[PDB]
Amino acid sequence: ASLPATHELHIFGSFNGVDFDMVGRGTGNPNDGYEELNLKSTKGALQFSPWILVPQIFHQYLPFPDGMSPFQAAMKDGSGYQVHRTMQFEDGASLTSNYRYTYEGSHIKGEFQVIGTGFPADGPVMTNSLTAADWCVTKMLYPNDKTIISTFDWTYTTGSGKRYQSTARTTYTFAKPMAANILKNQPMFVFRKTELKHSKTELNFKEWQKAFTDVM
Amino acid sequence: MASLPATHELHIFGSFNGVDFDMVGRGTGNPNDGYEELNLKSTKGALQFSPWILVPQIFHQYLPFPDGMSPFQAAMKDGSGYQVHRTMQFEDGASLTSNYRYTYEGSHIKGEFQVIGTGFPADGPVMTNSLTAADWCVTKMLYPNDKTIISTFDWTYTTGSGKRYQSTARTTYTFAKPMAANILKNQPMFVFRKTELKHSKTELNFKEWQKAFTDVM
Amino acid sequence: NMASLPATHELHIFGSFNGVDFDMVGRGTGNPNDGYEELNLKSTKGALQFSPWILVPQIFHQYLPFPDGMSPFQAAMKDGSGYQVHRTMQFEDGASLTSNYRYTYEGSHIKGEFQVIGTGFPADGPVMTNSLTAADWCVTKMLYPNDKTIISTFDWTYTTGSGKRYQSTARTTYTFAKPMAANILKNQPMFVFRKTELKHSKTELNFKEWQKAFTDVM
Amino acid sequence: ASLPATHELHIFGSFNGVDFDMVGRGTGNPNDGYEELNLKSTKGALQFSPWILVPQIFHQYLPFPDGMSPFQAAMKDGSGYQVHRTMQFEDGASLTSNYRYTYEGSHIKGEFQVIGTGFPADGPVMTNSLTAADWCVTKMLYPNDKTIISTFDWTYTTGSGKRYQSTARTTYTFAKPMAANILKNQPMFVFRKTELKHSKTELNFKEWQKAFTDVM
Ligand SMILES: [Cl-]
Ligand SMILES: [Cl-]
Ligand SMILES: [Cl-]
Ligand SMILES: [Cl-]
Known part of the structure; x- marks a missing residue:
């Protein structure tokens, strides 16, 4: 019906065969690309660095230089889109995910499945040794x-x-x-x-x- | 009742280029020499893509090692088991990711496989049904x-x-x-x-x- | 002393594509305040049997300024210690393109020796059929x-x-x-x-x- | 015009911008694929693990199950072939090489250019920590x-x-x-x-x- 103002996310799956699950709510501005989100675990302490969920954790907030992004257009007319992401890490680990959305006016509900495997026990993800994500350019x-x-x-x-x-x-x-x-x-x-x-x-x-x- | 597998069943599902698919069926095999055979049928009508793209998605519990049991076989016997996470990146930019879960009862395996494919071009061999065979292959x-x-x-x-x-x-x-x-x-x-x-x-x-x-x- | 950002350059570029040798030589200029470069090359061994577009971006980061001052490429030219470049390119149809760039500096002038080896370009692919029309604009990390x-x-x-x-x-x-x-x-x-x-x-x-x-x- | 009995190699180039150069002589058996080679550095002590020159350091010795390999057939008639190898390592290092050959009866003369870069100072190659190359299947x-x-x-x-x-x-x-x-x-x-x-x-x-x- 319209551009997004708020959203919620159910993000779930497994890392190294151990299940995880988080839920929470957020807001954003479709005019400038800003978005904010809180998430809480529903299954206790996370076994991995929470940074490994970036950028997993809403391009409906992204405008284009001269109008709506295709992501925004797809929200407005209700036809929508699906996302499929793969990430291959230097130390052999693999992280794959799929995002599904439903739209209620200016509200988005995200259902994100995320599977990570092959992260070494002594590597930076499983030892909580990640400090920040570099600024990034997507093509x-x-x-x-x-x-x-x-x-x-x-x-x-x-x-x-x-x-x-x-x-x-x-x-x-x-x-x-x-x-x-x-x-x-x-x-x-x-x-x-x-x-x-x-x-x-x-x-x-x-x-x-x-x-x-x-x-x- | 712990054993190497004699039979199996599969529920395989997911999507290709955003279009859902779902198949179910039953199979047998020989865990002394790695032989397996499987019949599947679609539950959502005609498949929109080459059935060859479901190979090798469609059971390493049938694989023995030269000196004895494979870890796949050993994990079935004692019931502790394993999970499988596969990524395939194609020359034309398409991507195919999948996740396999199993449950065991004696010599019988039940498989639940999720498979997501995207970015397969309209004129590529998957969507034009132009794949004729899979090459023989060595895994490391x-x-x-x-x-x-x-x-x-x-x-x-x-x-x-x-x-x-x-x-x-x-x-x-x-x-x-x-x-x-x-x-x-x-x-x-x-x-x-x-x-x-x-x-x-x-x-x-x-x-x-x-x-x-x-x-x- | 003549320590400087570059104004001019020359290039000898050579090697092979699908096992056939090629060789070009030429001269160029640029603006190290805004990253502009222009280069003219001519073959010394006949017609190129591949799309000349495959030599982009093979054919001088000493012309690139950084936002706050000199790039490391510029700084390495300015003091003469310099740098070597090693590039690998893997193409969607299975072709491979690897290269190595060596430089010498005299004041504001750069001399380049670039070795470039291409293999596995299919006979009916866009490189060997001269079907490349342009290079997309591009962001490097x-x-x-x-x-x-x-x-x-x-x-x-x-x-x-x-x-x-x-x-x-x-x-x-x-x-x-x-x-x-x-x-x-x-x-x-x-x-x-x-x-x-x-x-x-x-x-x-x-x-x-x-x-x-x-x-x-x- | 013959299958190989002996060979010699001049292998050269650089690792992390530092020049290296080795020369030597070898033998092999074209009926079973065996080959042996001894090399000596001409520029003093090597700055990297000598294991990183495997597999760089002669498929003219390899037979096929139905007769000559294409590598063998290319030597036997003298037409020959060129090799172009690229290797991308897990810690970000790259190793690319080019092999050229000339033939003198049953003797091969190899000229191999090898360029390695991005090998970290504390990685296994530069610390000489490599112990063996795994047995391997090529497709x-x-x-x-x-x-x-x-x-x-x-x-x-x-x-x-x-x-x-x-x-x-x-x-x-x-x-x-x-x-x-x-x-x-x-x-x-x-x-x-x-x-x-x-x-x-x-x-x-x-x-x-x-x-x-x-x-x-
Ligand atoms: Cl993205
Ligand atoms: Cl496998
Ligand atoms: Cl670059
Ligand atoms: Cl090889």
């Missing part, structure tokens, strides 16, 4: 009118000073075609910053986004 | 710790045009209890496999042969 | 795992005559003889937005590049 | 009559107990078309074992090879 292309393929190199800083790297690849599938003005402008880049304050069981997340085809 | 397995197997292979199909359709496969196995020392000593462990698939748009018959080895010579 | 190394990554795509893009994954390692300055090392990651243009025949090309480094667009 | 496909694409996951055991991994990819380009009996029989696998006895300045290398399409 988006449109191989057809109902598909976005997004790529970025994702890196955390760790307590040792070494970075922890992964190669991210995200596919968006739309039920209806994206508008002609979106498809004409390829590639579309998105710069993003994130912040996360976390405990063993709870986290508060913030994101800022800016889309651009050109910086000159 | 390593054990980074006593409860994890990392499996890698280069997965290729033949197509109608003669061009092969390629993907890079990575599979993680996560066990509830430690694998035995006789398993962990032999690294890398390689597995040579062959597959056959007869299919319509609603039904398929799958066969697989397997042979594990550390040394060809 | 740079990180510094130590004081003498830069690791760079980008997803590199061309438009083609068929209408569908030709993709590769690019990874570049820069190795510096002396440590990079602390102010450079503090600002990570450093992104670089770039545009390119290429006019070409089978034996000659005119290349243009525009660059803009940034840690933040907001 | 070979022929996308056309003059090209072979070789893939393998390459791992060393180390002194820490953790393996050191890379993803290896090799392209062979032939001057003449390979024979029909090769092109139809895809994929071709090759199982190999290696042994290395090394010092800072000298090494003895051994390799055993076996090509197969089916082990049932």
Whole structure:
């Protein structure tokens, strides 16, 4: 019906075969790409660094340079989209996820399944040694009118000073075609910053986004 | 009643390019030589994609090792079991991720497989139903710790045009209890496999042969 | 002494594509205050049997300024210690393109020796059929795992005559003889937005590049 | 014009921008794939683990199950082939190389250029922590009559107990078309074992090879 004002997320799955589950609510601004979110565990203490859930934890808040993003258009007309993300880490770990949304006016309900495996017991994720996520640029292309393929190199800083790297690849599938003005402008880049304050069981997340085809 | 498997059943489901699919069926196998065969039928009408893309998605509990039980077999016997997480990244940009869960009762396996595929082009061999066969394949397995197997292979199909359709496969196995020392000593462990698939748009018959080895010579 | 940011450069670029040798030589200029470069190259061994677009971005980061001052490439030229470049590119159709760049400096002038080896480009692919029409505008990500190394990554795509893009994954390692300055090392990651243009025949090309480094667009 | 009995190698290039150069002589058996090689450094002590020159340091010794490999056939008629190898390591290092050959009867002369970068100072290569190369299966496909694409996951055991991994990819380009009996029989696998006895300045290398399409 309209652009998003609020949202809620049920995020669940497993890391190294041990189940996790978090729920919570959030808000954001569709005019500038800002979004905020609180999450609490429903199954006790998290076994892994909560930073590994960034960027898992809402592009319906992202505007484009000259109008609505395809994500925003898909929310307004109700046809929507599905997300499918893969992340391969330097130390052999793999993190795959799928996002499903439903829309109630200006409210979004997220159901995000997230499966992580192969994270070494002594690596930065399982030892809670991640400190921050690097600022990041995503490259988006449109191989057809109902598909976005997004790529970025994702890196955390760790307590040792070494970075922890992964190669991210995200596919968006739309039920209806994206508008002609979106498809004409390829590639579309998105710069993003994130912040996360976390405990063993709870986290508060913030994101800022800016889309651009050109910086000159 | 602990045993190696004689029969299995599968519920396999998920989506390809945002379109849901669901199949169910039953199979048998020989855990002395890695043979298995499976019949599946669709529960949501005709499949929108090449049934070959469900191989190798569609049971390593049938695989023996050269010196004795595989960790897959050992985890079935004692009932502690394992989970499977597979990622396949295709040459044309498509991605196929999946997650396998099992339950056991004696010599019978019940499989619940979730499979999500996206980014398969409209004119690619998956969506045009142009995959003709799966190449015979060698998997490499390593054990980074006593409860994890990392499996890698280069997965290729033949197509109608003669061009092969390629993907890079990575599979993680996560066990509830430690694998035995006789398993962990032999690294890398390689597995040579062959597959056959007869299919319509609603039904398929799958066969697989397997042979594990550390040394060809 | 003549320690300087670059005004001019020359390039000898050579190696092979699908086992057939090629060799080009030429001269160029640029503006190290805004990242602009222009380069003219001519073949010394006949017609190029591959799309000249496959030599982008092979065909000078000494022209790139950073937002707050010199880039490490500029600083390495200014003091003469310099750097080596090692680039790998893996293409969607299974082709492989690896290269190594060596430089010498005389004041504001750069001499480049670039070795470039391409293999596995299919006979009916867009490179060997001269079907590449342009290179997409592109954002590179740079990180510094130590004081003498830069690791760079980008997803590199061309438009083609068929209408569908030709993709590769690019990874570049820069190795510096002396440590990079602390102010450079503090600002990570450093992104670089770039545009390119290429006019070409089978034996000659005119290349243009525009660059803009940034840690933040907001 | 002959199958190989002996060979010599000049291997050179750099690791992390530092030049290296080795020369030496070897023998092998073209009827079973065995080859042995001894090399000496010409620029003093090597600054890296000599294990990182495996598998860099002669498929002209490899037979196929139905006769000559394409590598053997290319030597026997003199048309030959070029090799182009890329290896991407788990800690961010890259190793690329190019091999050229000339033939003098049953004697091969190899000129191999090897460039390695991004090997961290505390990684297994630069600390000399590699203990052995894992036994390995290569997969070979022929996308056309003059090209072979070789893939393998390459791992060393180390002194820490953790393996050191890379993803290896090799392209062979032939001057003449390979024979029909090769092109139809895809994929071709090759199982190999290696042994290395090394010092800072000298090494003895051994390799055993076996090509197969089916082990049932
Ligand atoms: Cl994304
Ligand atoms: Cl597997
Ligand atoms: Cl770069
Ligand atoms: Cl090889």
